[PDB]
Amino acid sequence: ELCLVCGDRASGYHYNALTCEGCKGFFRRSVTKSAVYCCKFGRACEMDMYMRRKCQECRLKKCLAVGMRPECVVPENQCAMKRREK
Amino acid sequence: HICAICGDRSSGKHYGVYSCEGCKGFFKRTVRKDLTYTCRDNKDCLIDKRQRNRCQYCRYQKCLAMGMKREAVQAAAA
DNA sequence: CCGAGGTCATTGACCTCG
DNA sequence: CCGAGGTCAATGACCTCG
Ligand SMILES: [Zn+2]
Ligand SMILES: [Zn+2]
Ligand SMILES: [Zn+2]
Ligand SMILES: [Zn+2]
């Protein structure tokens, strides 16, 4: 029942890890656009419901550290037939 | 200063109470479009820099319980 | 029945203005 | 500076398919 990223209520497993809805979506966005966030304070921010929204670089480091995998985000499998919809 | 409604940072007094950017806007939109929320439990919803978005009803109510009111009603575009 | 892959209203950082 | 206003990318709730 707990999001391994921020400790919020988990909605299930997203990209192979138990997380909450926002962390799920923020991972998605982060991967699909190969984002490169840079920490303001000291790249070492602890995550909670507040902080998660305050440090993108640290929210992603953790999504990653908690087992959430990028390769599962729009992998090059079929269903890449939506790409064929004009 | 400290947001009196959540403990977040405060730019200064807003609508009559040291609040944060979050709470200022929440309050404005709520009054400006006159919204009515519901709540799932009582009014007992916690609310702080972390859980303030878990229950809008209780957030607005805590805003009332510390200041604010009309004031924000600055009509549209003024 | 989960979960991938989105959609879109709400949030709140950061500005202008008197 | 302060306290109104406004902007809007990002966020996160909800939704639809596979
Ligand atoms: Zn989370
Ligand atoms: Zn950080
Ligand atoms: Zn606040
Ligand atoms: Zn409530």
Residue whose Cα is closest to the C1' of D11: A22
Q: What is the CATH number of the domain that holds A43?
A: 3.30.50.10
Looking across all nucleic acid strands, the nucleotide with the smallest C1' to CA distance from residue A78 is D18
Helices A21-32 and A56-65: crossing angle, nearest 10°? 100
- Residue-number span of the structural domain to which A7 is assigned: 1-86
Q: Which amino acid is at B3?
A: C
Q: How many domains does chain B have?
A: 1
Per the entry, the structure determination technique was X-ray
Q: How many C-beta atoms surround the C-beta of residue B70 within 10 A?
A: 9
- Residue-number span of the structural domain to which B22 is assigned: 1-78
All residues of chain A having their beta carbon less than 8 Å from the beta carbon of residue B49 are: 50
- Would you state the structure tokens that stand for residue B36, as one six-digit string? 């009515």
Collapse the DSSP code of A22 into the 3-class scheme (helix H, G, I; strand E, B; otherwise coil) and give the result: helix
Tell whether the torsion through CA atoms of A12, A13, A15 and A20 is positive or negative. positive
Q: How many CB pairs under 8 A join A and B?
A: 6
Region label for B7, one of left (φ > 0), alpha (ψ between -120 and 50) or beta (otherwise): left
- Which of A24, A33, A34 lies closest to A68, judged by CA? A24
Residues paired with residue B18 on neighbouring β-strands, in sequence order: B13
DSSP secondary structure letters along B5-73: TTSSB-SEE-SSSEE-HHHHHHHHHHHHTT-----SSSS----STTTTTS-HHHHHHHHHTTS-SSTT-
- Which of A1, A8, A2 lies closest to A51, judged by CA? A8
All residues of chain B having their beta carbon less than 8 Å from the beta carbon of residue A50 are: 8, 49-50
Q: What is the CATH number of the domain that holds B41?
A: 3.30.50.10
